[PDB]
Design a protein around this ligand. Structure first.
Ligand SMILES: CC(=O)Nc1ccccc1O
Ligand SMILES: [Cl-]
Ligand SMILES: [Cl-]
Length: 182
């Protein structure tokens, strides 16, 4: 059930179908990507600037930084949605790196359906400052997408891409895809 075949459409990029969704992984700088939503993996204060969060907040700009701290003071949030600033996206969804990764990805998918968005790009959530294990993170991200497909929830969402800072973490994601393939 659900899983297609792993192939490489471009050097260093690997993909497979999960239901109707194209799931892709690659190594690189996520701030150079274009997608409807880019995901940030941050602290429970939404003001971290270390690792992926440093690159995202510096490239998005000061207006996005201020939107984050404004929402953080308003209520207790599991995640926040801001504009894209100077990134090539419509919105940034800022998730907490130390939280359950399957839950965080499920929330991102649901928010993207609510906006009728088609494409998402995320980092290896939790593997930076939060120091979650890469094998557990890969299993959680792919499980969230499988659950979303099984429930019949994929309508607008067509492409989910993980852009991963360390090539060694990319290798862990690729092995998990091969374990699942049809
Ligand atoms: C998960 C995470 O923070 N990754 C990352 C991305 C870019 C630079 C440094 C990094 O550690
Ligand atoms: Cl993290
Ligand atoms: Cl990453």
């Amino acid at each position: 059930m659900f899983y297609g075949t792993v192939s490489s459409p471009d050097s260093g990029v690997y993909e497979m179908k999960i239901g109707s969704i194209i799931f892709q992984v690659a190594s690189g700088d996520i701030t150079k990507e274009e997608a409807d939503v880019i995901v940030n993996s941050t602290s429970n204060s939404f003001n971290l600037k270390a690792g992926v969060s440093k690159a995202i907040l510096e490239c998005a700009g000061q207006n996005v930084e201020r939107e984050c701290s404004q929402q953080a003071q308003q209520r207790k949030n599991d995640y926040i949605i801001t504009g894209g600033g100077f990134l090539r996206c419509k919105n940034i969804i800022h998730v907490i790196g130390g939280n359950d990764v399957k839950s965080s990805v499920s929330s991102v998918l649901q928010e993207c359906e609510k906006k009728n968005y088609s494409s998402i790009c995320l980092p290896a959530i939790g593997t930076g400052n939060a120091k979650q294990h890469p094998d557990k993170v890969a299993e959680a991200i792919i499980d969230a997408i499988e659950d979303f497909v099984q429930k019949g929830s994929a309508q607008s969402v067509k492409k989910v891409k993980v852009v991963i800072f360390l090539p060694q973490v990319l290798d862990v994601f690729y092995a998990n895809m091969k374990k699942r393939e049809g």
